[PDB]
Amino acid sequence: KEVPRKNITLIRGLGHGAFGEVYEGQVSPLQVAVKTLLDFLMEALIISKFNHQNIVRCIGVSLQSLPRFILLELMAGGDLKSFLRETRPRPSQPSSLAMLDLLHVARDIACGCQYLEENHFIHRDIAARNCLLTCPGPGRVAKIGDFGMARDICAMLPVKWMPPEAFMEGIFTSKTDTWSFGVLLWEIFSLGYMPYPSKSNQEVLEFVTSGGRMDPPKNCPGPVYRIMTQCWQHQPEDRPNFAIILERIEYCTQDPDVINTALPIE
Numbered sequence: 001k002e003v004p005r006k007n008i009t010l011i012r013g014l015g016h017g018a019f020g021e022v023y024e025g026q027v028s029p030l031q032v033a034v035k036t037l038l039d040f041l042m043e044a045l046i047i048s049k050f051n052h053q054n055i056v057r058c059i060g061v062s063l064q065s066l067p068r069f070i071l072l073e074l075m076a077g078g079d080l081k082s083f084l085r086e087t088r089p090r091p092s093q094p095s096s097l098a099m100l101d102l103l104h105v106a107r108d109i110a111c112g113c114q115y116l117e118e119n120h121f122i123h124r125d126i127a128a129r130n131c132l133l134t135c136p137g138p139g140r141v142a143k144i145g146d147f148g149m150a151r152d153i154c155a156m157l158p159v160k161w162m163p164p165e166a167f168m169e170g171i172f173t174s175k176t177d178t179w180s181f182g183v184l185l186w187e188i189f190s191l192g193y194m195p196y197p198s199k200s201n202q203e204v205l206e207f208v209t210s211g212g213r214m215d216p217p218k219n220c221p222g223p224v225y226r227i228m229t230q231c232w233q234h235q236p237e238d239r240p241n242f243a244i245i246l247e248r249i250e251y252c253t254q255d256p257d258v259i260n261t262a263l264p265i266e
């Protein structure tokens with residue numbers, strides 16, 4: 001749990017996290033991500049309560065010295081949104097990334113979602129910016145890296161990932177997680193585009209509450225799009241839970257017409 005800081009050497013800034021900047025770091029020699037700053041406690045104990053292969057591991061905290069640190073598993077592949085964007089196939093080197101790689105990422109996150117659902121934990125912010133990769137190449141494993149707004153129970157709410165009952169009522173349940181997962185899937189299969197690409201948050205609210213949903217990402221196979229559309233059913237009771245989602249993802253991985261489908265080139 002507590003790590004003095006005598007052992008903690010920072011190495012490089014990684015970018016700006018939820019509360020602050022995150023560093024690649026070491027401990028002794030464990031390479032780690034050092035996340036910085038109730039909430040302090042909320043974030044910390046939460047991710048540390050879990051034990052699952054598709055959730056980032058917590059190594060410890062450094063709390064008696066300031067700034068305050070949570071030390072997490074270092075995910076050498078960075079975040080999923082950046083990965084998909086920098087690995088889009090191009091005209092210059094067009095990439096190794098294929099449909100099956102996309103389905104594996106999807107499968108890894110759902111398996112982490114399914115662990116949460118089974119433990120009655122509501123994420124509240126399933127989105128590609130919160131997903132990390134063990135490494136950039138084949139055999140990469142995707143993990144959930146940050147937990148949502150159990151730091152809660154705002155143009156700051158991630159409306160584009162939220163179902164109606166969540167944005168209009170403040171109702172969050174596993175089925176509101178299912179909705180967000182559908183949107184992630186869209187993010188995955190569009191290769192990192194912003195959801196509802198040409199719309200504002202206010203437009204989206206209006207769009208979605210009256211039944212509007214996103215078109216398939218370009219070249220998205222029908223069976224994958226169908227998972228999204230099922231995740232976006234208006235009534236939460238009609239949404240699939242994560243064991244169904246994973247079952248469906250897994251059929252996708254077994255259908256050649258899905259996995260042989262080529263990614264669009266940029």
Ligand SMILES: Cc1cc(Nc2ncc(Cl)c(Nc3cn(C)nc3S(=O)(=O)C(C)C)n2)c(OC(C)C)cc1C1CCN(C)CC1
Nearest residue numbers: 014015016017018022033072074075076078079082145146
């Ligand atoms: C985004 C990012 C993350 C990691 N590794 C990492 N590992 C473990 C954790 Cl828990 C983690 N969390 C984290 C990093 N950042 C910026 N924000 C967070 S966050 O608040 O925890 C949340 C938004 C996931 N990050 C990374 O490391 C390797 C390349 C060495 C590089 C990037 C790069 C993305 C794009 N490149 C160009 C620069 C940073």
